[PDB]
Design a protein around this ligand. Sequence first.
Ligand SMILES: Cc1oncc1/C(O)=C(\C#N)C(=O)Nc1ncc(S(C)(=O)=O)c(-c2cccc(F)c2)n1
Ligand SMILES: Nc1ncnc2c1ncn2[C@@H]1O[C@H](COP(=O)(O)OP(=O)(O)OP(=O)(O)O)[C@@H](O)[C@H]1O
Ligand SMILES: [Mg+2]
Ligand SMILES: [Mg+2]
Ligand SMILES: [Zn+2]
Length: 355
Amino acid sequence: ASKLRAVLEKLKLSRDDISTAAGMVKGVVDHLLLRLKCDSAFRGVGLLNTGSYYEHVKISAPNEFDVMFKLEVPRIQLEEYSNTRAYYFVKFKNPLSQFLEGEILSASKMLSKFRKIIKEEINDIKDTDVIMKRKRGGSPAVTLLISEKISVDITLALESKSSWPASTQEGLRIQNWLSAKVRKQLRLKPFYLVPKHAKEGNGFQEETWRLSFSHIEKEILNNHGKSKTCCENKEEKCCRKDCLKLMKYLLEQLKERFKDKKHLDKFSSYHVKTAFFHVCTQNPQDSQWDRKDLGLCFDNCVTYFLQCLRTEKLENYFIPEFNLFSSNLIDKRSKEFLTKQIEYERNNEFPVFDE
Ligand SMILES: Cc1oncc1/C(O)=C(\C#N)C(=O)Nc1ncc(S(C)(=O)=O)c(-c2cccc(F)c2)n1
Ligand SMILES: Nc1ncnc2c1ncn2[C@@H]1O[C@H](COP(=O)(O)OP(=O)(O)OP(=O)(O)O)[C@@H](O)[C@H]1O
Ligand SMILES: [Mg+2]
Ligand SMILES: [Mg+2]
Ligand SMILES: [Zn+2]
């Protein structure tokens, strides 16, 4: 109650920091898109603004932005990699011919050239401080740092206007919440492939791409009620986004405190975002998200997330047979360790939230 409202107040973004950040990001991004379009392989590239900033669920500071540089590949032919449900080979039924490795459009080759053109172009921005960060972790994105403060993740994304792959057939269970008619409209939209590679033993299948529905996630978060006027009037202010912000802060704070020995490195904000969409499906009515039930609604989010950890099950919201919490990705010790830390916080009314 009083305690969670105080935390939400602290996580609010300053209008002044938003104004300055948005100006700086949009200028660097609009420039790189202009420049990339001069390469014959990237002529049709377009921008999509995605992730927590554009979903209005970014917490603490506007210091991390996400953008997709999307490219329509017509006549695209997909082959699921090794029953992974989320990872695919891309084949054709000319423009990208330089990135072919046999019949296969190589994600690694396309990503290397994308990164190379961006790296060359930022070095000829003279008006503004822009560096590229080192290639770190499993991200499909190239990461920039603007004026030593603002991180920008830019992912290449192939756009397919074809029907979503079969692995999404039982995904996006929004019928009871956002309606069947909305599920149908959303599935008529394109889907994206980003250069995140399937695991292969010690290594990776450097050719493979992964499905992305970041654009659908944004549409859902910014149009998130059963009521079309959800959060447009002081009588319909739900706590859905407040719950997701508090879950993000719970995870960020535990990861910071356990930095000494880094037990929580496999966990990411996308784990709490996925878990949150599942609680939305379970609790489809706006009356299950009344501002006056914030503490209960937060508890619903914490308890589902604890069940996900204990059961080692957290389905991708779009691809049900893709388990983000399988032992292939996160070891059992790491899940039991996060379970123990979140139980403690739940049992002591979230001391990690004091200061
Ligand atoms: C940029 C951008 O714009 N739209 C989407 C988009 C975007 O990042 C993705 C898309 N589509 C995407 O898939 N990112 C992603 N995927 C896997 C992973 S991990 C934890 O490695 O498995 C990560 C990731 C890696 C390190 C830190 C971190 F915080 C996240 N990031
Ligand atoms: N493992 C993943 N699988 C699928 N999509 C992912 C994955 N990780 C990130 N994404 C997509 O990329 C977007 C940007 O990811 P990022 O890590 O920046 O998180 P975010 O949602 O922006 O939240 P924050 O940046 O505040 O932690 C996500 O919102 C999601 O659409
Ligand atoms: Mg982000
Ligand atoms: Mg990011
Ligand atoms: Zn609302």
